[PDB]
Amino acid sequence: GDEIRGDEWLATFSDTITLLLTFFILLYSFSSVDAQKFQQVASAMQVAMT
């Protein structure tokens, strides 16, 4: 009953993305976001979602 499941890639993808997220959170910890650039994105998502 050797079922063929195409999820062997999933373990590598999940761990690779997980440490990529953990590594990008580190960069954001000691970074300063541009307030004007963020304000454009924040206001645009209110329009898009609502």
Binding site: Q40, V41, S43, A44, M45, V47, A48, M49, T50
Partner: protein, 257 residues
């Protein structure tokens, strides 16, 4: 059999999800995204049409819908019906039962009893009626397998919408509207795919399998009641073997009549 866990489970499941969505002051429109509907709901449904032809897709949907109906009468009534049939069949013969076996709504008791009245040998009746049970279980398994197939397709297409959204977001970092549209696509495609899989498709297909097994047991004891009518026995050995098929929490219920 007046099952209440499934209606209650659905109300609490979506009621808790809806309560979570409407938590704080969030407006419910933020959870609606047409692009997301096309990607995960539309994409997984279209993948379902690749797996299942539309003619067979309609058939399995009908099979799923019919299994969740109220059906006919309970395991208590069929034993009462068979015992009443045994009294009438043991006095007026196997015939004169045509009126009694024609107003029934089982369509499986009717099939077996009609063969009994016609005078078909028990071996032929048993093999025909056991073939009905085997093929009905195959139909129910096909419907439940179809729900489980959709339960895997919807999260798979929800992840596709995530990649679509992130690729869109990262390729248009100078356009805030495209950033908002891409991120809304990625977030809501996963939300739709996880809701369909975990709140509907996966639980419901497993629910179909439990209902199929219960229905198979009901048909297994209807066959015994049919075969015992043909091999005429008094309505005390009939009620002796019919209650043996009852569930442990059901046998004592019949004892109180």
């Amino acid at each position: 059999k007046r099952d209440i866990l499934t209606p209650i489970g659905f109300v609490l499941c979506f009621g808790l999800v809806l309560w979570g969505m409407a938590s704080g002051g969030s407006n419910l429109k933020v959870f609606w995204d047409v692009a997301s509907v096309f990607i995960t709901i539309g994409g997984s449904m279209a993948a379902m049409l690749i797996t299942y032809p539309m003619d067979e897709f309609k058939r399995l949907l009908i099979v799923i819908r019919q299994t969740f109906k109220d059906n006919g009468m309970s395991n208590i009534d069929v034993i009462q019906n068979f015992v009443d049939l045994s009294r009438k069949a043991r006095r007026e013969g196997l015939l004169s039962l045509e009126d009694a076996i024609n107003n029934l709504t089982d369509d499986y008791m009717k099939k077996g009893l009609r063969m009994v009245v016609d005078g078909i040998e028990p071996e032929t009746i048993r093999e025909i009626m056991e073939l009905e049970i085997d093929e009905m279980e195959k139909r129910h398994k096909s419907g439940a397998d179809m729900l489980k197939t959709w339960g895997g397709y919807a999260p798979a297409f929800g992840m596709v919408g995530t990649l679509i959204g992130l690729i869109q977001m990262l390729a248009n970092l100078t356009d805030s509207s495209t950033i908002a549209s891409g991120m809304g696509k990625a977030l809501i495609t996963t939300f739709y795919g996880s809701l369909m899989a975990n709140a509907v498709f996966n639980p419901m297909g497993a629910n179909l399998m439990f209902k199929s097994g219960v229905e198979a047991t009901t048909r297994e004891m209807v066959l015994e009641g049919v075969l015992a009518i043909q091999s005429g026995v008094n309505p005390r050995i009939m009620e002796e073997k019919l209650v043996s098929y009852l569930s442990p929490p059901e046998r004592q219920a019949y004892s109180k009549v």
